[PDB]
Each structure stands twice: as structure tokens, then as C-alpha cells.
Amino acid sequence: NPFQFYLTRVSGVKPKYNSGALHIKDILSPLFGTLVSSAQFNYCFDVDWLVKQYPPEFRKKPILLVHGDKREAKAHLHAQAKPYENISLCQAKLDIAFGTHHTKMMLLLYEEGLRVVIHTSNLIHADWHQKTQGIWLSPLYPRIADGTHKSGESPTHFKADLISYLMAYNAPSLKEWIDVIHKHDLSETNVYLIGSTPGRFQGSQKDNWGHFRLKKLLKDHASSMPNAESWPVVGQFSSVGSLGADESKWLCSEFKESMLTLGKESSSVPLYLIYPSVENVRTSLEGYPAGGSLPYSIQTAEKQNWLHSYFHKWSAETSGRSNAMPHIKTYMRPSPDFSKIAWFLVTSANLSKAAWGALEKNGTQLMIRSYELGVLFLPSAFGLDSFKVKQKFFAPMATFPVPYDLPPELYGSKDRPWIWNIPYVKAPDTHGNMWVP
Numbered sequence: 001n002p003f004q005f006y007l008t009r010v011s012g013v014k015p016k017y018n019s020g021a022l023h024i025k026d027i028l029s030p031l032f033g034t035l036v037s038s039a040q041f042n043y044c045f046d047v048d049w050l051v052k053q054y055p056p057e058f059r060k061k062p063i064l065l066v067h068g069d070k071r072e073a074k075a076h077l078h079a080q081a082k083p084y085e086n087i088s089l090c091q092a093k094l095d096i097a098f099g100t101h102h103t104k105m106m107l108l109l110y111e112e113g114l115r116v117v118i119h120t121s122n123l124i125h126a127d128w129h130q131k132t133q134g135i136w137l138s139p140l141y142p143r144i145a146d147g148t149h150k151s152g153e154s155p156t157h158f159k160a161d162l163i164s165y166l167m168a169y170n171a172p173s174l175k176e177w178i179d180v181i182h183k184h185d186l187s188e189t190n191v192y193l194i195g196s197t198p199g200r201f202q203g204s205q206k207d208n209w210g211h212f213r214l215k216k217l218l219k220d221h222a223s224s225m226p227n228a229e230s231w232p233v234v235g236q237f238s239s240v241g242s243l244g245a246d247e248s249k250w251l252c253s254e255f256k257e258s259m260l261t262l263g264k265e266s267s268s269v270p271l272y273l274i275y276p277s278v279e280n281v282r283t284s285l286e287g288y289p290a291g292g293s294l295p296y297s298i299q300t301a302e303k304q305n306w307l308h309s310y311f312h313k314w315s316a317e318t319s320g321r322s323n324a325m326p327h328i329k330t331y332m333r334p335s336p337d338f339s340k341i342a343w344f345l346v347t348s349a350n351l352s353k354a355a356w357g358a359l360e361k362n363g364t365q366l367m368i369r370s371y372e373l374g375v376l377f378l379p380s381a382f383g384l385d386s387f388k389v390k391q392k393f394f395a396p397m398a399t400f401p402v403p404y405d406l407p408p409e410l411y412g413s414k415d416r417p418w419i420w421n422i423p424y425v426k427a428p429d430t431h432g433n434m435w436v437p
């Protein structure tokens with residue numbers, strides 16, 4: 001694999017569907033490196049559980065938890081960590097209202113080098129048990145020799161871009177990790193970093209983050225093909241924000257416009273959004289409790305019923321994961337027959353203005369509320385014009401492992417989007433229960 005894109009292990013599926021999947025215990029194993037220290041960026045943590053995922057011999061190495069919690073939530077996280085004197089905390093500043101620290105990333109410093117893991121799972125048992133989640137594993141980055149002056153930079157600029165992402169926190173604990181990254185050679189990295197950080201970005205900074213960062217990378221490092229208008233956009237996510245009273249407010253004006261960019265020159269493009277139906281959740285491995293990790297409120301949904309006409313069912317026969325509800329987020333640009341893709345992104349970013357950014361000030365400023373992080377696979381970074389789509393996820397350097405089924409299937413007339421804070425009492429789930437929140 002040039003791509004090093006993995007799914008998490010799913011408990012209960014046949015072993016053939018976990019061959020080449022990774023559990024957190026595999027990622028932290030001594031086989032991956034001799035751990036010196038680590039940073040865990042995430043949203044939600046079960047600290048007792050997390051420490052148990054490290055090998056016993058590594059459980060007292062320093063761990064930094066990077067989170068966004070405030071007030072009582074912050075106090076609860078500190079109380080979780082206080083029995084472990086090797087655990088330090090970094091509170092990411094969230095100075096714009098209604099923002100979240102969503103980024104899921106591990107920085108793993110070893111005796112042998114450095115590894116970066118950008119993934120989609122919270123650090124709690126449920127997120128690694130029976131969900132569909134995505135993982136990108138960096139190479140083992142060697143240390144640059146003392147006194148050697150080299151950039152250690154990749155053709156995708158990943159080293160400087162990761163440092164730039166960390167610099168936005170303005171945090172002393174992350175400056176130490178910046179200095180660690182400076183000392184390592186990341187030149188083998190073949191993905192582009194796409195982050196979101198909170199702020200109001202104008203001028204050149206406009207292109208640093210969010211959907212303008214995606215747009216810039218697609219303009220600079222992809223090429224437009226004939227009939228590009230027929231290549232769909234696919235977005236796939238676990239949470240839905242308030243997008244406005246109609247599709248022209250944001251979804252099909254600035255968001256789609258960024259997503260359909262290819263090349264440097266200058267819309268009928270089909271837009272497929274994949275999000276679990278109520279039936280998807282009810283019949284899932286977890287049952288209705290899977291919907292506790294699919295946050296879409298009735299208050300949000302009832303103001304944008306227009307959106308649900310874009311919604312397609314979760315289906316993942318290709319990876320044996322149709323009943324493993326998605327907490328991965330992915331965006332990609334398939335060909336009209338879905339046999340090829342022009343790019344693929346795995347990220348923390350859900351379908352929300354908070355995550356991707358919303359233009360302000362007459363289109364001159366991009367406002368982002370949250371921290372998000374993903375990695376972009378572009379054919380040009382692999383010496384290719386496009387990626388073939390892998391037919392069976394677990395069945396090579398030209399063939400990208402898309403983890404769910406194509407083409408996506410539209411909701412039926414009786415399907416509804418999973419909405420997490422209303423009851424479902426008409427048909428029981430796989431554990432025999434109803435949903436009464």
C-alpha cells in the first residue's frame with residue numbers, strides 16, 4: 001500500500017473483514033515503535049480505557065491530551081487524568097462561539113523516529129468496537145542527524161503544514177511537539193494536510209484552512225478533465241450542522257464550489273451526501289445506541305428539510321461494514337461511472353459551516369469555528385492521473401481502497417435521516433430495544 005489508509009477493527013464481523021484493519025492496541029504496539037512519549041488530539045476521552053490501550057511497558061511514558069473542554073467538562077477531564085502523573089493536558093482555545101475541538105491525531109515519538117496518525121475515532125471503547133472509522137498511518141519518520149541542516153520536507157509540504165496547524169494553538173506543550181517535528185525527516189509523506197482552526201481568515205491566510213484550503217490544493221495539484229461537470233462529488237459524515245434555509249445559502253454555493261474545483265482555469269455536478277437513515281441505525285451492530293454518535297438534532301433538521309433530498313443510505317458491503325455505523329468522514333470526486341476517483345479525503349470534518357468555514361465580509365473572509373484535521377490523497381502525489389477504485393476493500397499502487405459501496409443508494413420514500421433526540425418506538429433494534437432519549 002502506498003496509501004496506508006486503514007479501517008478500525010469491527011467486533012463481530014468475519015475475520016476476513018478485519019484482515020488489515022487496525023485496533024488502537026495495534027497502533028500503539030511495540031511493533032510500531034519503542035514509545036518515548038505521545039500526544040493524543042481528540043474530542044472525547046476515557047482516560048482509564050486509553051491508558052489500557054498502551055502496551056504495559058509504555059503505560060508510564062508521557063501522554064499529552066489535547067482537547068477543547070471548558071468549565072465543568074474541563075474539570076471532569078482533569079479528574080480523569082489526575083491518577084496518572086504522566087498525563088498532561090492542553091486546552092485548545094475556542095474563542096469563537098459554538099466551536100469544537102474535533103481533530104483526532106496521534107503524535108507518537110519513538111526511540112526510532114516519529115509517527116503521525118490522523119484518524120476519526122474518539123478515545124472511548126465504543127468508537128473502536130463496532131463503528132466504521134478511518135486511519136491514516138504516516139511512515140516511520142527518521143530523525144535528522146545532529147548538525148545536519150536539511151528541510152525534511154515532502155513534495156506535499158506536509159512537514160511545514162503540520163507545524164502550521166500546531167502553531168495555531170499557541171500552546172507551550174505543542175511548541176515542544178513542533179520542535180520534535182522539526183528534528184525529523186517527513187520527506188516521504190505523500191498526502192496533503194487539510195486542517196481547520198478557529199478564526200477569521202483574510203488575504204493570503206484565506207487559503208490556509210477549511211474548504212478554501214481544499215479548493216487551493218485542487219486548483220494547484222489536480223487537473224480538470226473533459227466532462228468534469230459529470231464527475232460527482234461525494235460527501236460522507238456523521239453529523240450535520242445548520243446549513244441555511246436552502247441549498248444556495250452555503251451547501252451548493254461555496255461548499256460545492258470548493259469541492260468541484262479542478263485545476264487552474266475557470267453547475268450541473270451531482271452531489272451525493274451519505275448519512276445513516278433510521279433503518280441503517282436500527283439494524284446496525286450496535287442498534288439504536290449507534291445513534292448516540294450520529295449527532296443531528298431535530299432542531300437543526302426541521303429547518304432544512306430540503307437537505308434530505310441529497311441523502312443516501314450507508315452501505316459498505318465492499319468492506320463487510322454495512323451494519324457498522326460510520327463515524328469516519330470522507331469526501332471524494334468519482335468519475336461518472338464511479339470506477340475512478342480524482343481525489344479522496346479522510347477527515348474529522350462533518351457537514352457543517354463550523355467545520356469547513358463560511359465566507360463573511362462580502363466573500364473576503366473565511367470564518368471557522370472548530371479544529372478539524374484530515375489528509376488528502378491526490379493522484380499527482382502518486383505519479384498518477386486518477387485512482388482506480390478498489391472493487392473489494394480487503395481483496396495496488398493505482399487502486400484506492402474506498403471503504404463503502406458505489407454508487408451510493410438514495411433514501412427510499414419511507415426512509416428518514418437519523419435524528420438523535422427524538423424517539424423511535426415502532427420497531428426494535430438488533431438488541432431488542434427502542435430509542436427513548
Ligand SMILES: O=C(O)c1ccc(Nc2c(-c3ccccc3)nc3cc(-c4ccccc4)ccn23)cc1C(=O)O
Pocket residue numbers: 043098100101102122238239292293294295348350
Ligand atoms: O460526529 C462527530 O464527529 C461529532 C459530532 C459532535 C461532537 N460534539 C458535540 C456534541 C455531543 C455531545 C455529546 C455526545 C456526542 C456529541 N454536541 C454538540 C453540539 C454542538 C453544537 C453546535 C452548534 C450549536 C450548538 C451546539 C457541537 C458539537 N457537539 C463530536 C463529534 C466527534 O466525534 O468529534
